Amino acid sequence: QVQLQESGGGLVQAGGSLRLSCATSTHTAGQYTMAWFRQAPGKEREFVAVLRWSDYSTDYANSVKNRFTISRDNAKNTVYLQMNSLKPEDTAVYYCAAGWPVKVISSADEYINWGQGTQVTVSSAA
Amino acid sequence: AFEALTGINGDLITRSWSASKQAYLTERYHKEEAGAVVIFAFQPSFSEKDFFDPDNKSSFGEIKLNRVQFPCMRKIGKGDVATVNEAFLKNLEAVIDPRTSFQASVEMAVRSRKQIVFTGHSSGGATAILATVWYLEKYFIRNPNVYLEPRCVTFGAPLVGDSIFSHALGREKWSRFFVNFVTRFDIVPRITLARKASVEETLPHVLAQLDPRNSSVQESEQRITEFYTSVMRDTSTVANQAVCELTGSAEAILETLSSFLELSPYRPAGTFVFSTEKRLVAVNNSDAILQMLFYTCQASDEQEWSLIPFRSIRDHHSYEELVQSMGMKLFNHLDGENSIESSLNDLGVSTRGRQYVQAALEEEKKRVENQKKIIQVIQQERFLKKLAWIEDEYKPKCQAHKNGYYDSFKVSNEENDFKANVKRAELAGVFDEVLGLLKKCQLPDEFEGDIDWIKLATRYRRLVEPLDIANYHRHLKNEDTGPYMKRGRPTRYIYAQRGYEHHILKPNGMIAEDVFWNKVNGLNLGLQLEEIQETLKNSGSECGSCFWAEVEELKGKPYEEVEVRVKTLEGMLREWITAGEVDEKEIFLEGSTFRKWWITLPKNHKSHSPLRDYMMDE
Secondary structure, three states, rough: OOOOEEEEEOOEEOOOOOEEEEEEEEOOOOOOOOEEEOOOOOOOEEEEEEOOOOOOOOOEEEOOOOOEEEEEEEOOOOOEEEEEOOOOOEEEEEEEEEEOOOOOOHHHEEEEEEOEEEEEEOOOOO | HHHHHHHHHHHHHHHHHHHHHHHHOOEEEEEEEEEEEEEEOOOOOOOOOHHHOOOOOOOEEEEEEOOEEEEEEOOOOOOEEEEEHHHHHHHHHHHHHHHOOOOHHHHHHHHOOOOEEEEEEEEHHHHHHHHHHHHHHHHOOOOOOOOOEEEEEEEEEOEEEEEHHHHHHHHOOOHHEEEEEEOOOOOHHOOOOOHHHHHOOOOHHHHHHHHOOOOOOOOOOOHHHHHHHHHHHHHHHHHHHHHHHOOOOOOOOOOOOOOOOOOOOOOOOOEEEEEEEOOOEEEEOHHHHHHHHHOOOOOOOOOOOHHHEEEHHHHHHHHHHHOOOOOEEEEEEOOOOOOOOHHHHOOOOHHHHHHHHHHHHHHHHHHHHHHHHHHHHHOHHHHHHHHHHHHHHHHHHHHHHHOHHHHHHHHHHOHHHHHHHHHHHHHHHHHHHHHHHHHHHHHHHHHOOOOHHHHHHHHHHHHHHHHHHHHHHHHHHHHHHHHHHHHHOOOHHHHHHHHHHHHHHHOOOOOOHHHHHHHHHHHOOOHHHHHHHHOOOHHHHHHHHHHHHHHHHHOOHHHHOOOHHHHHHHHHHHHHHOOOOOOOOOOOOOOOOHHHHHHHHHHHHHHHOOOHHHOOOO
């Protein structure tokens, strides 16, 4: 069982950037597919980004592709999601999840370990 | 409980699964040193060529093992070698190639005296199995003190060997080193139970689906369902015929010449651990594991016939959850349990499947009971008194008459000779009964390796095979049937010889026939190897207790005709005497057939013979 702890969430102005960290209790390179999911108020837990155990490849949901970046520091056992061009509709609780073999990256049922999540609130413009 | 039975803990299982996952990213194998353990994980493959070799012309991709490389993987008395999947064997051979540095890493791990572990997922597990056997044949059997016990841990592995494979693992007490985790519906352990023609068309797509590195772009449901149904039909045939052959149908039209309903020869080897959401069920008995491989993969737990094939595909990838949830599962060892109903009900085994598994376990219990009765019969004093009478009474009394008990029995002029004949017949009856039990696979796998049995059978052979040879030539059976070594030797003596020889020779890795030919070639007779093997064809110089037989075949013939054979016999005789195979107080007596014949040999031969000091007064 991999232990996952997210951190770095908070309040951010629209258009800003924010980096979320996910500390993993063991190395995940070639061991677990690592994903970022998000759940907004009322909606369901939807997929954001993935870094695969198979080939170290990254993939993103279309709503975040070319503005979000998933990465991993293997030395620190940490998985990062750097978010850019944030919009008010990105306001959600963000989770990092670990799974294997995850032949369906976008399905939450493929991931066996989850974190408690970190809140991200993107504000409009006063 | 689990650790007391398998000899591995949860930390080792977790490291093994981690290394098995990592092995996907490394060529051939991945080596991981974790504290007191060194793990060799093998890269699995999901190409059709890696399950059924394209060049293999047999119905199950099987091939007989080479007796030189795996000399223990055979039946000792019968001689039949084990059979393995040829593709897995070629993968093993490609790993152990000196150019891969696998062997050097294994030997470096041996020098460190850590627990060496061979592990693997899917076909990698298969390789792991073979790798372990390789280790066991190359290092552990040679010196178990510097080459320590291996552990083998497989996840969703296909079957590798046949029934002789599992039997040889059991006789050497090697099965305890193998632990094969199988999630309840995993289809991969069942694949090679099917004829390769039954899945030849659908296997590539299902193997692509089973590959943990591929994405499921919603391919074909129908091909997966058809693959499951083919595998389950052939598995059903195999398991039901195992049931019928174990105690029901025996032999009716089972033999060859009728290759109609071919059944897979592969059988479970080692300990298997079936896993549900709440249980870990460990099984040792191979037949029970085969029956369970069939009956746990049925639409029975909820009779959801439509969903079970996709469960069978997904369960090949569910070993992550298995490893993460081991400690929270209830464990039970099926072989040692008083009631197996809870475990098999939790595994979805139907009532008929439950009865078949119970029958397999009961058959193993019957084999243990047979071995117990055999040891009680051979340990009572009324039985040993016959051998003791032949040893301390008949042999000395015959040495006193200066003719030896062989010739004394052959002429049978005294009442002691008929008494010896009676005791010979009784001992022959007992050993023929044990042989009949062995032939029918009604004794435990360990039987032929049990040191007490080997000692008693060797004593019996050395003492009484001369009397059976004397009985053979006394009734002129050499003229009706033929030479004793070719058409007359009782199979019980062959079994005893082979058990003794394997026991004393397996630490050096050579089989008795190769040792014999090496010795006769070291005699430096100066002839071609084929010519010598032709001259020594069906010779009595391969076993000391057959000495007299060879003598009977050599006396009366001219010296130039049998010079090679007589020199070979003389060259073997001294080691035979030292080992206790031939009594030096018997063969050189004045009235012995051997001495009377040896005097007639050319004086030039007697002058340079190693035996002239034993028969100085000709």
